[PDB]
Design a protein around this ligand. Structure first.
Ligand SMILES: *[C@@H]1O[C@H](CO)[C@@H](O[C@@H]2O[C@H](CO)[C@@H](O[C@@H]3O[C@H](CO[C@H]4O[C@H](CO[C@H]5O[C@H](CO)[C@@H](O)[C@H](O)[C@@H]5O)[C@@H](O)[C@H](O[C@H]5O[C@H](CO)[C@@H](O)[C@H](O)[C@@H]5O)[C@@H]4O)[C@@H](O)[C@H](O[C@H]4O[C@H](CO)[C@@H](O)[C@H](O)[C@@H]4O)[C@@H]3O)[C@H](O)[C@H]2NC(C)=O)[C@H](O)[C@H]1NC(C)=O
Ligand SMILES: *[C@@H]1O[C@H](CO)[C@@H](O[C@@H]2O[C@H](CO)[C@@H](O[C@@H]3O[C@H](CO[C@H]4O[C@H](CO)[C@@H](O)[C@H](O)[C@@H]4O)[C@@H](O)[C@H](O[C@H]4O[C@H](CO)[C@@H](O)[C@H](O)[C@@H]4O[C@H]4O[C@H](CO)[C@@H](O)[C@H](O)[C@@H]4O)[C@@H]3O)[C@H](O)[C@H]2NC(C)=O)[C@H](O)[C@H]1NC(C)=O
Ligand SMILES: *[C@@H]1O[C@H](CO)[C@@H](O[C@@H]2O[C@H](CO)[C@@H](O[C@@H]3O[C@H](CO[C@H]4O[C@H](CO[C@H]5O[C@H](CO)[C@@H](O)[C@H](O)[C@@H]5O)[C@@H](O)[C@H](O)[C@@H]4O)[C@@H](O)[C@H](O[C@H]4O[C@H](CO)[C@@H](O)[C@H](O)[C@@H]4O)[C@@H]3O)[C@H](O)[C@H]2NC(C)=O)[C@H](O)[C@H]1NC(C)=O
Ligand SMILES: *[C@@H]1O[C@H](CO)[C@@H](O[C@@H]2O[C@H](CO)[C@@H](O[C@@H]3O[C@H](CO)[C@@H](O)[C@H](O[C@H]4O[C@H](CO)[C@@H](O)[C@H](O)[C@@H]4O)[C@@H]3O)[C@H](O)[C@H]2NC(C)=O)[C@H](O)[C@H]1NC(C)=O
Ligand SMILES: *[C@@H]1O[C@H](CO)[C@@H](O[C@@H]2O[C@H](CO)[C@@H](O[C@@H]3O[C@H](CO[C@H]4O[C@H](CO)[C@@H](O)[C@H](O)[C@@H]4O)[C@@H](O)[C@H](O)[C@@H]3O)[C@H](O)[C@H]2NC(C)=O)[C@H](O)[C@H]1NC(C)=O
Ligand SMILES: *[C@@H]1O[C@H](CO)[C@@H](O[C@@H]2O[C@H](CO)[C@@H](O[C@@H]3O[C@H](CO)[C@@H](O)[C@H](O)[C@@H]3O)[C@H](O)[C@H]2NC(C)=O)[C@H](O)[C@H]1NC(C)=O
Ligand SMILES: *[C@@H]1O[C@H](CO)[C@@H](O[C@@H]2O[C@H](CO)[C@@H](O)[C@H](O)[C@H]2NC(C)=O)[C@H](O)[C@H]1NC(C)=O
Ligand SMILES: *[C@@H]1O[C@H](CO)[C@@H](O)[C@H](O)[C@H]1NC(C)=O
Ligand SMILES: [Ca+2]
Ligand SMILES: [Ca+2]
Ligand SMILES: [Ca+2]
Ligand SMILES: [Ca+2]
Lengths: 297, 589, 325
């Protein structure tokens, strides 16, 4: 039982350090707490589809089919358009630098067959530019997906444009597909609750206010740094049976990791080799040989 | 503000050798010891037949040891035909170090042409990467005479990039148009050949010759490195003090293909705009910022008379490509404020880099002054937080020149704070100033109740009008310091009454208007607070019920028990060290 | 915590030695008296030159993979008989008698990326890739946006799932199609990418070499010659942590407990008797000092109060697996 008790005291010093806190804060309701944050908590645990500190998670719902979302679109039966207000975005995350992860999550209804989906971004309030792509699988139950639009949200908080949005059409074969119904509400949740919302994960102002060879070779670190090591086959191994290469930079991780945390590599790179087998030369590639980065875990 | 002036390390070299003309740090392989690199360009060496060849000394933090860069004399081109002249070559005039690499140069090295018998100051450098010692003379070429690189004086100023490229300045190239040469360190040692006097490097980056109007410009007089075009490759910054018809300029070239990026121009004739330059991010935006010294800048006085005080311009780099430029004028006449500019790193570990600027001829007896300036969100603090004074009088000849060269941003004692070396070649001396740890103290004082009744008997006594005095104390530091900081706290009740008046307060059990308490508190943990009871005197004992009773709380540190193994005593942050006071009142009607 | 040496580097070297031999499933280096010194074909040098070119984009994944490549069919056969080349699409064709000869059994195939050669295209282009279905139909694969490269660029597309299906059928002819992006809901189309092609008209003596650098399918498979929890080793043990029971913190409402596991077990190397057998779990990183560290971690959302309730999510808390590296 003594093995388990040491890690707990490291968790205590971790959580407080992740909150950048030395001590916990210093009430209501005697019943169940508000379901506005329980909707956030139920949306954060639902996963179907460097920076060790904490991120404050907040969400924002979309605009109904009212509020001028209709005089521009409405009828393209093979697409769905979603719009948001910037006056509420730059209030949850004031500075665009505080934003860390911004994934757009929707809600699927149709369970039969499969469809192919393309995602676009709003440009010039008329033009749409490509973003990402994802194929969909016939799941018998309602499934919850998510699209990482962090790079999009970050640029929108720097702009004073108080009106932005997204577009979700289907595949274009170069023929319209995807949304075979004209109600626009058969394939996804429109004008109802649980409607598409943009989940945000940013760092509070209270907080703000793993480098590789590019730092580990130019500086003399006393901590967990990746050290240089060139391995020769003829010199450090005595192997003349490997034609190419005849030496490479495998390197290694050496260094302490204090607040047993070890100096382990984080990023590794494969190595192609050339050797013969009797009379048959085989060009093979070994997986994970060159140590690039190093972490502490 | 936190530089230790009480007990600085005094290093010395041979007299008359200009020991301290160039200074730098040394941090070799792994977690080893640290050293000071000091240049003495007029120092006699053991080289056969070489008078005042100069040397660079390795000093231990505490005897100094000469570094053997070259033991040989003058090589012969032929019998009775010397090839080179190492006498009076000023080896060690500029010293720059990167990890286990030490680069020293001889700007006044002359070399005889390989076509005829000349004596042309092309300059040469010696590089030591551990054991191997190589020569580096990129201006010792077949491009001879003043029209070429014959009077280049390569190695007049040097610096290292973060990608193992050397940056060399040559003010005399192309009839003193000047030239910047950059070579990869992998190519310098690999292509070195002691039998080849003009080595051509393929990856050499150089400012080629221009029109005759640009002669006598002294490009390469000073150098500094930093990224400016937002790519990741350290770019080349250099002062061109005689450019623009003696207005002075600073050229910025790309560190990849040698192309001009940005320009700065002096604003006064013959102000030597560009004598010294430095590049360090001062406002915490990861954009290196340009510091240009103009030690001969003359400003106008209050009386309408001109006065030479020197000027440094501070240019804040922005991602939009522009620069936010301000100007910092010197304090002393003829002090040549701005002669040397050394980035200090974060001297006080506040989250913003700081910088030092020297006036080598300021202060009493023109001994020398170094001013410390701190960074902030809006840039550099124009007012200095610490004044470094020279202690060494001028014997005869050159003035002490305290501050003429300096280098910072290296924590030589593993104390958590970067330290600073200051050279004074006129007295052959170098002085190490160690940064003292900075203690931030948050003191509190609560007085409840605020209103003391004339007869409120509550606390136990065989009972008099009494009240509770609760004072809290919390401290912390950011570096290598012990946990247990011993504080000495003094409290004085009713201080406003001078010694001799009628006092009205005194503690309940201490029976004395003052209470002393020795306080060991731990930094970082939690705030340690302590309560105690004091009472007011009876009504009939003093008719003076109008003089508000100020409770005074004073606090201090032991320093001796908070010092380090090296004897470095910490120091309080400067705007928030003071004691605090509050007050309670007796009312009526 | 005692001085430390430069022998740490030699500890890596002796761990690399046993590592290379274990990934090749070899006990001792092979014989080189059966190998002729001198001939180094430029056919295998193009393989090695394409593997060092890293285009940006279990127990069987730790061993070595035999890398072979196959060039495509020229436009002088079958590629002009139906469509030829047009501004709308670009067609590349391959065989199968050489695809199923370099990788005989479809299961051996591990990664099959199709690599091309870009020319300078400047500002912007968007490309969609398709696969040949039956003979008539084409189905979507992947897409990729293009960057203004002033120099010739080399790309690669992971079509492993396609090649595996091609190795299972005895289809003697396969191929790909390269069109561009389709802007629809309102209709737009065209392709502007310059890929190393045939240009149809280059003749003379140098014309033969103008078929080099043509699109090829790089294959990485496992040779046919190889084929084939109880806390003893470094395994992750169960541990349920309650906040009220193991921490005594009543200031966190949700959640009220989670499973924060841990890694327990030794990771040594180069032991007597040897081992070169169990090298995939003992020290797959070949480090000087392997530690039983977590490899995969999962974040944890939390709910706490301050008048403002803040929903935050902690990074790296739940330990899933444990490795030695
Ligand atoms: C910040 O400020 C600084 C300082 O102002 C600035 O740096 C300078 O920028 C200016 C910008 O124009 C540069 O000026 C250019 O210089 C070019 C020089 O390089 C070539 O040209 C030489 C020209 O010879 C001169 O002399 C002869 C007589 O001898 C005369 O006839 C010519 O007309 C000319 O005046 C040329 O000789 C030289 O060639 C060398 O090598 C050959 C072998 O190949 C050898 O035979 C030669 O003997 C010589 O050794 C060299 O190649 C110049 O060409 C260029 O010309 C442009 O402008 C003119 C006038 O407008 C046009 O007519 C012409 O078509 C070109 O467009 C131009 O004058 C100056 O050189 C910079 N100084 C440096 C780099 O040190 C920065 O740019 C500023 N920063 C920013 C961001 O702007
Ligand atoms: C598969 O890959 C291998 C290597 O990975 C390759 O073998 C090599 O082919 C290249 C061809 O690109 C050869 O590189 C050439 O080298 C000569 C001279 O190199 C000497 O020195 C080397 C030591 O490094 C010796 O081993 C060698 O035997 C030679 O003695 C260069 O002159 C070539 O051209 C350069 O200069 C030109 C000017 O004439 C430039 O226009 C050109 O860009 C070349 O590069 C120069 O400019 C670059 C900037 O763009 C700069 O970065 C360079 O440093 C240089 O200054 C050419 O580089 C190489 O020697 C071969 N290796 C060996 C061991 O022989 C296979 O051919 C390849 N198989 C294929 C493609 O099928
Ligand atoms: C010697 O080296 C220098 C630099 O080392 C070379 O200078 C480079 O020139 C090229 C032009 O060939 C420039 O590329 C252009 O980029 C445009 C897009 O902007 C990008 O660059 C920005 C640079 O940073 C900016 O801010 C800094 C301040 O920090 C300023 O000082 C700087 O001047 C810039 O303003 C990035 O910040 C930005 O994010 C972008 O990434 C392109 O529009 C441009 O044209 C392209 O598109 C054309 C049609 O649209 C097409 O026809 C062209 O072929 C081209 O593809 C071009 O790409 C580099 O930006 C510039 N370097 C730097 C650091 O700015 C110099 O060319 C070289 N000389 C030789 C002979 O090799
Ligand atoms: C938000 O998240 C909370 C949890 O974080 C979630 O609470 C869930 O409530 C349901 C109850 O509807 C729990 O599921 C139940 O589990 C018990 C066994 O432990 C079953 O007996 C329950 O019976 C169901 O089946 C009936 C069939 O006739 C249904 O008619 C009936 O309605 C019951 O659903 C049921 O299986 C569930 O365990 C919790 N969640 C967790 C993690 O425990 C809440 O519903 C979420 N709210 C929203 C709006 O998303
Ligand atoms: C006559 O004199 C009496 C004694 O000199 C006075 O009695 C005092 O009355 C004040 C109220 O005005 C009390 O102040 C309160 O104290 C509580 C203490 O609770 C805290 O205790 C500890 C600190 O010791 C802390 O850790 C806890 O967490 C609690 O927070 C405060 O919480 C209140 O805010 C309030 O300030 C004095 O404590 C009390 N003195 C004594 C000795 O009990 C009396 O008021 C005087 N009459 C007058 C002026 O008319
Ligand atoms: C380094 O060593 C050199 C000698 O190797 C020192 O130079 C010497 O300097 C003194 C003056 O400081 C010279 O004395 C002079 O002699 C002439 C006669 O030739 C006389 O007329 C002058 O009035 C003066 O007394 C001496 O000649 C000269 N030595 C040589 C060989 O020229 C130099 O001072 C040393 N520097 C340091 C920093 O140690
Ligand atoms: C408590 O410390 C403060 C420091 O702020 C002392 O205030 C100084 O007062 C003298 C004269 O009263 C001034 O000349 C100084 O300039 C003040 N210091 C500062 C920083 O402004 C105060 O005197 C101390 N308390 C006692 C009783 O001496
Ligand atoms: C506290 O220490 C001081 C020395 O700074 C000493 O003079 C004094 O007597 C000590 N007082 C107590 C109560 O220990
Ligand atoms: Ca740069
Ligand atoms: Ca800056
Ligand atoms: Ca600072
Ligand atoms: Ca220090």
């Amino acid at each position: 039982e003594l093995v388990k008790r040491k890690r707990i005291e490291a968790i205590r010093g971790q959580i407080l350090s992740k909150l950048r806190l030395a001590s916990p804060p210093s009430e209501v309701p005697p019943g169940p707490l508000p379901e506005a944050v329980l909707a956030l908590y139920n949306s954060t645990r639902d996963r179907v589809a460097a920076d060790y500190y904490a991120k404050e998670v907040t969400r924002v719902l979309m605009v109904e089919t009212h509020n001028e979302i209709y005089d521009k679109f409405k009828q393209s039966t093979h697409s769905i358009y979603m719009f948001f207000q910037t006056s509420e975005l730059r209030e949850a995350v004031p500075e665009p630098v505080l934003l860390s992860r911004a994934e757009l999550r929707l809600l699927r209804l149709k369970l039969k067959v499969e469809q192919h989906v393309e995602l676009y971004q709003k440009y010039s309030q008329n033009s749409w530019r490509y973003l990402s792509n994802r194929l969909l699988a016939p799941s018998d139950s309602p499934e919850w997906l998510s699209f990482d639009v962090t790079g999009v949200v970050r640029q929108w908080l720097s702009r004073g444009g108080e009106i932005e949005g997204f577009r979700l059409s289907a595949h274009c074969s170069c023929d319209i597909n995807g949304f075979t119904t004209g109600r626009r509400g058969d394939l996804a949740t429109i004008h109802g609750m649980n409607r598409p919302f943009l989940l945000l994960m940013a760092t509070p102002l209270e907080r703000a206010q793993a480098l590789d060879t590019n730092y580990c070779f130019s500086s003399t670190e006393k901590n967990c740094c990746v050290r240089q090591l060139y391995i020769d086959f003829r010199k450090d191994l005595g192997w003349k049976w490997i034609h190419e290469p005849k030496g490479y930079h495998a390197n290694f991780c050496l260094g302490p990791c204090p607040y047993a945390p070890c100096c382990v590599p984080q990023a590794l790179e494969p190595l192609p080799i050339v050797y013969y087998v009797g009379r048959k030369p085989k060009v093979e590639q070994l997986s994970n040989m060159i140590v690039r980065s190093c972490k502490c875990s | 503000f936190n530089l230790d002036v009480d007990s600085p390390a005094e290093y010395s070299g041979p007299e008359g050798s200009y020991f301290g003309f160039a200074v730098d740090f040394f941090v070799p392989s792994a977690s080893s010891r640290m050293f000071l690199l000091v240049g003495a360009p007029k120092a006699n060496t053991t080289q056969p037949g070489i008078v005042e060849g100069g040397q660079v000394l390795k000093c231990d933090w505490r005897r100094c040891q000469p570094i053997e860069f070259d033991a040989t004399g003058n090589r012969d081109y032929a019998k009775d035909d010397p090839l080179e002249f190492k006498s009076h070559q000023w080896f060690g005039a500029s010293v720059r170090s990167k990890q286990d690499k030490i680069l020293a140069c001889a700007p006044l090295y002359h070399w005889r042409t390989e076509m005829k018998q000349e004596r042309e100051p092309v300059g040469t450098c010696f590089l030591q990467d551990g054991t191997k010692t190589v020569e580096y003379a990129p201006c010792r070429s077949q491009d001879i005479d003043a029209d070429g690189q014959g009077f280049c004086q390569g190695g007049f100023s040097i610096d290292f990039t973060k990608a193992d490229r050397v940056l060399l300045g040559g003010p005399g190239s192309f009839y003193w148009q000047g030239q910047l040469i950059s070579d990869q360190v992998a190519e310098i040692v690999s292509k070195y050949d002691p039998n080849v006097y003009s080595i051509k490097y393929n990856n050499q980056l150089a400012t080629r010759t221009a029109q005759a109007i640009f002669d006598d410009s002294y490009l390469g007089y000073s150098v500094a490195v930093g990224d400016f075009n937002g790519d990741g490759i350290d770019d080349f910054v250099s002062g061109v003090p005689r450019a623009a018809r003696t207005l002075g300029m600073v050229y910025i070239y790309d560190g990849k293909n040698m192309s001009s990026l940005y320009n700065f121009t002096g604003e006064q004739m013959a102000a030597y705009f560009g004598f010294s330059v430095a590049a360090t991010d001062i406002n915490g935006d990861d954009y290196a910022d340009v510091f240009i010294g103009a030690p001969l800048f003359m400003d106008r006085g209050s009386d309408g008379k001109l006065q030479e005080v020197g000027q440094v311009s501070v240019s804040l780099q922005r991602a939009s490509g522009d620069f936010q430029t301000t100007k910092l004028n010197g304090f002393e006449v003829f002090a040549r404020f701005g002669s040397a500019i050394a980035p200090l790193g974060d001297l006080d570990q506040d989250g913003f880099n700081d910088i030092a600027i020297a006036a080598p001829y300021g202060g009493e007896d023109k001994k020398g002054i170094v001013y410390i300036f701190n960074g902030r969100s809006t840039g550099l603090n124009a007012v200095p937080s610490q004044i470094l004074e020279g202690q060494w009088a001028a014997r005869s000849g050159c003035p002490p020149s305290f501050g003429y060269s300096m280098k910072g941003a290296t924590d030589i004692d593993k104390n958590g704070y970067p330290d600073l070396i200051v050279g004074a070649f006129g007295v052959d001396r170098a002085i190490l100033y160690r940064a003292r740890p900075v203690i931030t103290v948050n003191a509190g004082l609560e007085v409840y109740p605020s209103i003391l009744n004339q007869d409120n008997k509550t606390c136990s006594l065989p009972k008099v009008s009494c009240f509770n005095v609760r004072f809290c104390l919390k401290a912390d530091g950011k570096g290598v310091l012990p946990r247990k900081l011993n504080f000495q706290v003094e409290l004085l009740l009713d201080k406003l009454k001078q010694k001799g008046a009628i006092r009205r307060a005194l503690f309940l059990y201490s029976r004395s208007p003052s209470h002393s308490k020795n306080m060991t508190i731990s930094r970082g943990g939690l705030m340690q607070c302590e309560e105690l009871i004091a009472y007011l005197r009876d009504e009939s004992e003093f008719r003076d019920k109008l003089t508000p009773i100020t409770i005074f709380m004073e606090y201090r540190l032991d320093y001796r028990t908070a010092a380090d193994t090296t004897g470095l005593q910490p120091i309080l942050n400067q705007f928030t060290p003071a004691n605090i006071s509050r007050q309670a009142h007796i009312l009526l009607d």
